[PDB]
Write an enzyme that holds these catalytic residues in place. Structure first.
Site, PDB file in Angstrom:
ATOM      1  N   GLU A   1       0.779  -1.220  -0.010  1.00  0.00           N
ATOM      2  CA  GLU A   1      -0.036  -0.019   0.068  1.00  0.00           C
ATOM      3  C   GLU A   1       0.922   1.196   0.015  1.00  0.00           C
ATOM      4  OE1 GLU A   1      -2.699  -0.284  -1.055  1.00  0.00           O
ATOM      5  OE2 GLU A   1      -3.677   1.340   0.111  1.00  0.00           O
TER       6      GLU A   1
ATOM      7  N   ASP B   1       9.236  -4.836  -7.499  1.00  0.00           N
ATOM      8  CA  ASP B   1       9.104  -6.366  -7.374  1.00  0.00           C
ATOM      9  C   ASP B   1      10.711  -6.618  -6.246  1.00  0.00           C
ATOM     10  OD1 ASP B   1       7.574  -7.640  -8.985  1.00  0.00           O
ATOM     11  OD2 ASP B   1       8.606  -6.360 -10.506  1.00  0.00           O
TER      12      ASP B   1
ATOM     13  N   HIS C   1       3.010  -1.232  -4.311  1.00  0.00           N
ATOM     14  CA  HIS C   1       3.310  -2.313  -4.988  1.00  0.00           C
ATOM     15  C   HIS C   1       2.747  -3.597  -4.364  1.00  0.00           C
ATOM     16  CE1 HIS C   1       4.869  -4.314  -8.745  1.00  0.00           C
ATOM     17  NE2 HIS C   1       5.437  -5.210  -8.009  1.00  0.00           N
ATOM     18  N   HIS C   2       1.832  -4.425  -4.952  1.00  0.00           N
ATOM     19  CA  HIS C   2       1.131  -5.569  -4.212  1.00  0.00           C
ATOM     20  C   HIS C   2       1.773  -6.861  -4.727  1.00  0.00           C
ATOM     21  CE1 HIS C   2      -1.397  -2.027  -4.398  1.00  0.00           C
ATOM     22  NE2 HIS C   2      -1.354  -2.412  -2.803  1.00  0.00           N
TER      23      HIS C   2
ATOM     24  N   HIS D   1       3.177  -5.169 -13.314  1.00  0.00           N
ATOM     25  CA  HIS D   1       2.170  -5.395 -14.236  1.00  0.00           C
ATOM     26  C   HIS D   1       2.355  -4.384 -15.718  1.00  0.00           C
ATOM     27  CE1 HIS D   1      -1.247  -4.391 -16.547  1.00  0.00           C
ATOM     28  NE2 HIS D   1      -1.349  -5.957 -16.724  1.00  0.00           N
ATOM     29  N   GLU D   2       2.894  -3.122 -15.567  1.00  0.00           N
ATOM     30  CA  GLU D   2       2.939  -2.422 -16.589  1.00  0.00           C
ATOM     31  C   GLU D   2       4.390  -2.249 -17.476  1.00  0.00           C
ATOM     32  OE1 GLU D   2       4.321   1.745 -16.893  1.00  0.00           O
ATOM     33  OE2 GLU D   2       3.771   1.876 -14.654  1.00  0.00           O
TER      34      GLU D   2
END
Lengths: 99, 99, 99, 99
Positions: free
Chosen positions: B53, B84, B57-58, B75-76
């Site tokens: 949060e 990461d 980054h999840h 993801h992008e």
């Protein structure tokens, strides 16, 4: 339950050894923990709250950023029961996880 | 941005020596932590999700009792990234406090 | 323990009725829940956790950002007990709060 | 950075409706909450922590079983900062859902 002199003496020490005080005014035992940050202070409160339901014996705490003051003392016997002795042992067992 | 090999190749190991690793079907490092009880696996997830949060980054994760499997990517980027990477380092710590 | 005929026929109907699908392969019911954010997806996970540990019955969940996917079956039964079912709905009653 | 007269008059009211109160002493609003149970209250305490984390502006709170008491001031400001004014507001976006 409602700690006897007999009991309460012999249970109390280790707690006493780590910062746990008896409260003047009520039959309670308090202690403030000061973590290194919020993620810790809250990582802490969580496993503890995950464990206050498990037992269905909840604390009295207060967090700011990285300090939480925890007050224990039974509602059932308006006192310090073995109940919170346990819980505190666990509480202690958790902080140690956290730095 | 998306890791090169010079990057992957400096970055990587350190986590790898720890147990992290590329997936075969896609650019993403898996790792599956395994604790002693639920209470610990959740306090650990509470600690990363506060983190997640924060730095937005999840992880894609999955828990059962005391097992939690964590898989990262960006993801992008369609792939690994510095994110990461910061993430596994973090998760890596938090984890070392649960043992 | 391993939910029988009318039992299921009487109990399960209600859950399917709210998207609780059935698992292909195990004796389990599952559900996936789309939230609006992680802030939710996790505030939920936690309130369910607090309960999976109050009754000693945990989910198998998987989570990415806002999604949450729940599979439930008692493994002591190795299959659909009650356990799932009364947890299924506590877990339903949660998702209402946010969704 | 600190909330002028104007600011409060526009800003502060609505919050004031729903319960927020300014204490005498240091500059800060305040607000006792009371929920069905501890699941509900920690469930709410978490979404709120996830955010004070995302935004780096932590409450000052006390939790009993289901009663939660919040206090927001802003260290620098040595009073209400726009941070506070909105963290209360999220904190309400959280609240209601619970009930």
């Amino acid at each position: 339950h409602r700690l006897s002199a007999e009991e309460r003496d012999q249970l109390l020490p280790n707690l006493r050894a780590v910062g746990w005080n008896e409260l003047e005014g009520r039959d309670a035992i308090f202690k403030q923990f000061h973590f290194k940050d919020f993620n810790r202070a809250f990582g802490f409160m969580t496993r503890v709250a995950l464990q206050a339901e498990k037992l269905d014996h909840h604390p009295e705490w207060f967090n700011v950023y990285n300090k939480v003051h925890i007050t224990l003392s039974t509602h059932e016997c308006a006192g310090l029961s073995e109940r919170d002795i346990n819980l505190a042992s666990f509480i202690e067992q958790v902080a140690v996880s956290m730095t």
